[PDB]
From a paper:
[name] is one such EF-hand Ca2+-sensor expressed exclusively by endocrine cells of the pancreas, adrenal medulla, pituitary, gut, stomach, and subsets of neurons in the nervous system. [name] is built by three domains (denoted here as A, B and C), each comprising a pair of EF-hand motifs. In mammalian [name], domains B and C undergo conformation changes upon Ca2+ binding, and form a surface groove in domain C for the docking of both [name] and syntaxin-4-derived peptide ligands. Here, we identify [name] as a molecular switch between syntaxin-4, a protein facilitating the movement of reserve vesicles toward the active zone, and [name], a core member of the vesicle fusion complex.
When testing for pairwise interactions by coexpression, copurification, and size-exclusion chromatography, recombinant human [name] also bound the [name]-[name]-25c chimera in the presence of Ca2+ (noting that mouse and human [name]-25c are identical). Thus, recombinant human [name] together with the [name]-fused SNAP25-derived peptide could also be used in X-ray crystallization aimed at resolving the structure of ligand-bound human [name]. We determined the X-ray structure of both mouse and human [name] bound to the [name]-derived peptide ligand at 2.35 Å and 2.30 Å resolution, respectively. In both cases, [name] carrying the target peptide (155-GIIGNLRHMALDMGNEIDTQNRQID-179) as C-terminal tag was employed whereby the large globular [name] module served as a crystallization chaperon that was necessary to obtain diffracting crystals. The P212121 crystal’s asymmetric unit contained two copies of the protein complex, wherein the [name] molecules were identical; superposition results in a Cα-rmsd of 0.54 Å and 0.66 Å for the mouse and the human proteins, respectively. Even for [name]-mediated crystal contacts, its interaction with the [name]-25c fragment was limited to 1 and 2 hydrogen bonds for mouse and human structures, respectively, making the target peptide freely available to [name]. The electron density map allowed us to model a 17 AA-residue (155-GIIGNLRHMALDMGNEI-171) and a 16 AA-residue (155-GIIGNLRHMALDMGNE-170) section of the [name] peptide for the mouse and human [name] complexes, respectively. Contact points between [name] and the [name]-peptide were dominated by hydrophobic interactions (155-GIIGNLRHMALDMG NEI-171, polar interaction/hydrophobic-stacking). We obtained similar values for human [name] with a buried surface area of 886 Å2, accounting for 50.9% of the total surface area (1,740 Å2).
Residue numbers in the entry:
A (entry chain D): 12 to 69, 78 to 276
B (entry chain A): 2 to 64, 68 to 247
Write the structure that this text describes.
């Protein structure tokens, strides 16, 4: 049993990643899973029993992953699930890092590099053969249109990227103090390097979050396209960065910082 | 505000005007309904003293802005509903360019289940063959912006706008409105940020009404106010994505 096979089984019950299944799905889950391991009708009721028991003696994905997968394949499915990426800026630093040819998509070879570094980071030596196998499994799990490359949103799901930070802000918070508070929250979030201007991946993350307020999840090529457009709109000094004072004026902030 | 919940659905309306223009006395009675969720008004008025000595279009702004639609994000700016049900005083001077003026005082309030607008109007200095007393206005109405500012000292709002009345020779007659609204009650009201109301109205006749009368349909929505930051972001995002 590999992560992809477990994932395909998990799909029947949790297609949109609640992260769990329900207690009367459980038996049908073991059934279907046990069916997947190629199990005989003669051994079914016992294996089901033993399995149910082990679990009872121990419904979220981590629990079913530990039973049916190796520690390296659990890692693949849960390395971020326990530690989701909180910042879209950090996300785009990773994206830029691994989209080394700037094609706007993560190819199989770039995914392999991502995973090599990932395993080294968690101080885990895996063979070259498993590196290849895992790249293939990850691709299969996360390549939605099976076209052989990973899109922006696909890496986002691999990294368990949290909700768009911008979605917390509301139309009716319209007072000057409300808008100033929210503007400061926003700029603190994107200006990770605390330079007073959004640069490189800080722009990226802001562009992604802004465009996804009004469009379905955007592609890597569209990001670069919208980044240019946003800069042509708001980059008053034309230095390739968004100074706070430029973002503030472009968002209608009453008092320019 | 609590007043806002009074306008949830369809609300019946009554209007009474006692008028005097260059000594010509007249009275108008109106009825209809308001549906503020749609910024929607439907009203019929009749002159009960005989013929009206001024054009119906000159009386349209005098003869219930508590029926304007306020988008959800501008609700804290709706003065007119906030004064309800005790109501408000609406005072105006309307200066018709190159002619006389109206001075009006209205109380707008709930009287039981009905929104009632009671007005007194005085008109002076009108030229006897000018556009108003000559009846040279076309029977129609244009679309305007009504600009609203808070008046904190009066616990109310000051309101200014110009209406454009088509003349039958093809010119336009301007009427310059100076408006003040004051709560009648001691209850708390909502003082708005600067904004405006955008209006559109159509005039018609009831074929089965023998008296001098006007039928009026109007749509009114507020606008102009800063929304939350998310508003600016959303609208910028929209434009960045064109083409
Ligand atoms: Ca690439
Ligand atoms: Ca793909
Ligand atoms: Ca920065
Ligand atoms: Ca700049």
């Amino acid at each position: 049993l590999d992560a992809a096979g477990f994932w395909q089984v998990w799909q029947r019950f949790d297609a949109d990643e609640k992260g769990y299944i329900e207690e009367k799905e459980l038996d049908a889950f073991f059934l279907h899973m046990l069916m997947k391991l190629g199990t005989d009708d003669t051994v079914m009721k016992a294996n089901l029993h033993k399995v149910k028991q082990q679990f009872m003696t121990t419904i979220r994905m981590k629990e079913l992953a530990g039973m049916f997968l190796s520690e390296d394949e659990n890692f693949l499915l849960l390395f971020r699930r326990e530690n989701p990426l909180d910042s879209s800026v950090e996300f785009m630093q990773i994206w830029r890092k691994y989209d080394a040819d700037s094609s706007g998509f993560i190819s199989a070879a770039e995914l392999r590099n991502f995973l090599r570094d990932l395993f080294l980071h968690h101080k885990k030596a895996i063979s070259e053969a498993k590196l290849e196998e895992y790249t293939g499994t990850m691709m299969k799990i996360f390549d939605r249109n099976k076209d052989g490359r990973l899109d922006l949103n696909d890496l986002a799901r691999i990294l368990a990227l949290q909700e768009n930070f911008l979605l917390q802000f509301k139309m009716d918070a319209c007072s000057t103090e409300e808008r100033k508070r929210d503007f400061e929250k926003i700029f603190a979030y994107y200006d990770v390097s605390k330079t007073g201007a959004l640069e490189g991946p800080e722009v990226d993350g802001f562009v992604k979050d802004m465009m996804e307020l009004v469009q379905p999840s955007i592609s890597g090529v569209d990001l670069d396209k919208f980044r240019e457009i946003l800069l042509r709109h708001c980059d008053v000094n034309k230095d390739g960065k968004i100074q706070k004072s430029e973002l503030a004026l472009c968002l209608g902030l009453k008092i320019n910082p | 505000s609590k007043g806002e919940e009074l306008f949830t659905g369809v609300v019946p309306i009554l209007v009474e005007l006692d008028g005097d223009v260059n000594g010509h006395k007249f009275s108008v009675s109106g009825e209809g309904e308001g549906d503020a969720t749609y910024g929607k008004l439907t009203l019929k008025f009749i002159c009960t003293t005989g013929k009206l000595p001024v054009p119906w279009p000159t009386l349209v702004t005098t003869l219930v802005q508590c029926f304007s639609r306020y988008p959800d994000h501008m609700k804290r700016h709706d003065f007119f509903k906030s004064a309800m049900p005790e109501g408000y005083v609406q005072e105006r001077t309307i200066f018709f360019k190159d002619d006389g003026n109206y001075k009006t005082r209205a109380e707008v309030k709930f009287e039981g289940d009905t929104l009632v607008n009671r007005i007194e109007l005085k008109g002076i200095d009108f030229k006897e063959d000018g556009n108003i007393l000559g009846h040279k206005l076309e029977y129609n109405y244009n679309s305007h912006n009504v600009y609203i500012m808070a008046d904190k000292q009066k616990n109310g709002i000051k309101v200014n706008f110009k209406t454009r009345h088509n003349i039958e020779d093809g010119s336009v007659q301007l009427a310059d409105h100076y408006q003040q609204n004051t709560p009648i009650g001691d209850g708390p009201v909502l003082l708005p940020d600067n904004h405006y109301l955008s209006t559109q109205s159509a005039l018609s006749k009831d074929p089965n009404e023998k008296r001098d009368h006007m039928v009026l349909l109007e749509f009114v929505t507020a606008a102009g106010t800063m929304a939350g930051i998310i508003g600016n972001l959303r609208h910028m995002a929209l434009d960045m994505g064109n083409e």
